[PDB]
């Protein structure tokens, strides 16, 4: 897309304003599932994402890989158990998308992560 880096910069300024004004972005971004399909006109799309069930019950119109998986930028994926050293053994683990605020006037930012663990209650 055109003008994209500029838009990324403006979006950064938007989120940094959001935390400054005490209307936090977690009250501005509900989460949908993982997209699988789309038909696009010129600058107008119709994405389609799962909402319940497991991802690979779907059927993508790629015809190279009908099913899919879930991809997360490894730069942000922060594991917890192996981090906290619970001494546990990896079985079925939950998955949490977490936001990190920091508040210092005119000098503030937001950190994102995707956390997995067996812990049902983060707290």
């Amino acid at each position: 897309d055109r003008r994209t880096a500029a838009r990324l910069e403006r979006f950064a300024t938007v989120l940094r304003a959001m935390i400054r004004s005490h209307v936090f972005p977690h009250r501005a971004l509900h989460v949908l599932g993982g997209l699988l399909g789309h038909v696009t006109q010129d600058r107008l799309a119709s994405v389609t994402c799962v909402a319940r069930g497991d991802q690979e019950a779907a059927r993508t119109n790629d015809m190279a890989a009908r099913r899919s998986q879930v991809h997360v930028p490894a730069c942000a994926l922060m594991d917890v158990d192996r981090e906290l050293r619970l001494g546990g053994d990896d079985g079925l683990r939950f998955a949490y998308l977490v936001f990190v605020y920091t508040q210092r006037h005119r000098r503030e930012a937001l950190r994102v992560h995707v956390a997995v663990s067996r812990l049902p209650e983060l707290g």
């Binding site: 038909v39 696009t40 006109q41 107008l44 799309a45 119709s46």
Partner: protein, 49 residues
């Protein structure tokens, strides 16, 4: 004297503008109706919407 020019309505071409049927019990019927159903065709669009 003078004759009397008789005329029958079905001979005139105006008859083909309507269907005429005797209904000898019209004096009894309340407000009658007629039911239509119609099914508009449709053409398949595509794209986003």
């Amino acid at each position: 004297c003078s004759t009397l020019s008789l005329v029958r309505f079905l001979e005139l071409g105006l008859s083909v503008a309507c269907v005429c049927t005797k209904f000898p019990e019209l004096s009894y019927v309340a407000e009658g109706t007629i039911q239509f159903e119609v099914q508009q065709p449709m053409i398949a669009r595509d794209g986003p919407h």
